[PDB]
Amino acid sequence: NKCVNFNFNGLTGTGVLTESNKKFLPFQQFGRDIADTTDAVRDPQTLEI
Amino acid sequence: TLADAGFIKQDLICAQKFNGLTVLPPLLTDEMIAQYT
Amino acid sequence: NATRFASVYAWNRKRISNCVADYSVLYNSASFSTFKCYGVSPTKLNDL
Amino acid sequence: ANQFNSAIGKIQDSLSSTASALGKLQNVVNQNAQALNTLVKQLSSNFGAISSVLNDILSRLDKVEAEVQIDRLITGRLQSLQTYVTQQLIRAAEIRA
Amino acid sequence: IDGYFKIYSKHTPINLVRDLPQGFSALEPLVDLPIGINITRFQTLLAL
Ligand SMILES: *[C@@H]1O[C@H](CO)[C@@H](O)[C@H](O)[C@H]1NC(C)=O
């Protein structure tokens, strides 16, 4: 809920982070928006989305 | 079936907003237009 | 640091996987005379 | 009176039924949506740079080596806006009339 | 592809006596292994 200079695996940027409801399948780790931008990520230490 | 008009954001239009593209509200609302009509 | 490298026509390939890299060891080592990158800058190798 | 009332009734019965009537308005809206969708989608181009993602350049390259890649993205994106704002202007002359 | 080999898979129930089913469904990724060899032929194995 805070604005932050994020990074995940090397997915750098700046943004507000939030807990997703999206059901990823076990193999998935990024999601992408209609833009071809990321919009969701699995955290590489604790496997919430 | 309008793809947004600026009615309170708090999908094409999430991407638009995140790239500084914003739909602005019109001066006269659909109610005021209906009133002039 | 292997004892022997390979003939270039038959250039050996070794995988690197499920490990943590520290590119500062290499990027700080005086022993190289060429250390050029071609899709990244070397200061970022620890950051990625 | 009855003919006028019957005719107003036929406009209702028409507009309720048919899927082709408001094409004149709908085509204006459809282009506004599509031109914004196009202007979004141009952000995914390379313009010959090493990525369409701005941060995948900056987090990979140093200052000097970034300036080539970033100048390529400005050369693309900025033309992408002038194109849209031309299209929008011209479109605006269609709507102003 | 270019130094990598990968297998996707799907499993579903159906009731067709001698045919491959009418419909639509997708195969999810299961492994990747960097074999990096020319591959030109294959053969299936089955038990008695
Ligand atoms: C792999 O085999 C094919 C078929 O014989 C051949 O054309 C190709 O050149 C081979 N690849 C290498 C790297 O030798």
3-class SS letters over chain E: CCCCEEEEECCCCCCCCCCCCCCCCCCEEEEEECCCCCCCCCCCCCCC
Rounded to a whole number, what is the distance in Å from the CA of A41 to chain D's nearest CA?
A: 16
Reading the block at residue D4, the tokens are 């006028």
- Signed CA dihedral, A27, A33, A36, A39: sign only: negative
The structure tokens listed for C25 are 């060891």
Tell me the structure's resolution in angstroms, rounded to a single decimal: 4.3
Length of chain A in terms of residues written: 49
Helix (H/G/I), strand (E/B), else coil: B13: helix
β-pair partners for E33: E5
Min Cα separation A3/chain D (Å): 17
C-alpha distances in Å from residue D46, one per residue of A19, D69, D79, E27: 32, 9, 14, 30
Bridge partners of E31, per DSSP, are E7
**Do the Cβ atoms of C40 and D60 come closer than 8 Å?**
yes
Give B14's contacts in chain A (Cβ within 8 Å).
Answer: 33-34
Q: Is the Cβ of D39 closer than 8 Å to some Cβ of chain B?
A: yes
- Tokens 């590489």 locate to A44
* Helix D63-96 / helix D23-41 crossing angle, nearest 10 deg: 170
**Angle formed at CA C18 by CA C12 and CA C19, multiple of 5 degrees:** 85
What are the tokens at D53?
């993602």
Dihedral pair phi/psi, residue D86, rounded to 5°: -65, -50
Q: Per the structure block, which two tokens stand in for B14?
A: 């999430």
Going from the C-alpha of A13 to that of each of B13, C20, C42, the distances in angstroms are 20, 23, 20
Q: How far, in Å, CA of D44 to CA of D51, rounded?
A: 9
The b-or-e profile of D42-63 (16+ CB within 10 A means b, else e) is bbeeebebbbbbbebbbbbbee
Burial (0-12, 13-18, 19+ Cβ within 10 Å), D36: buried
Cβ separation A10–D40 shorter than 8 A: no
The letter for the amino acid at A7 is: N
Distance CA D46, CA D35 (A): 20
E38 lines ligand 1 (CB under 6 A): yes
Q: Which residues of B2-32 are buried (b: 16+ CB within 10 A; e: fewer)?
A: eeeeeeeeeebbebbeebeeebeeeeeeeee
**Is D45 within 8 Å of D52 (Cβ atoms)?**
yes
Q: How many of the other CB atoms lie within 10 Å of CB of D70?
A: 15
Ligand 1 center to E38 CA (angstroms): 6
How far apart are the CA of E37 and the centre of ligand 1, in A?
A: 10
| Closest CA to ligand 1's atom 10 | E38
Cα–Cα nearest to B21, from D28, D51, D80: D80
Cα–Cα dist C14/C1, whole Å: 13
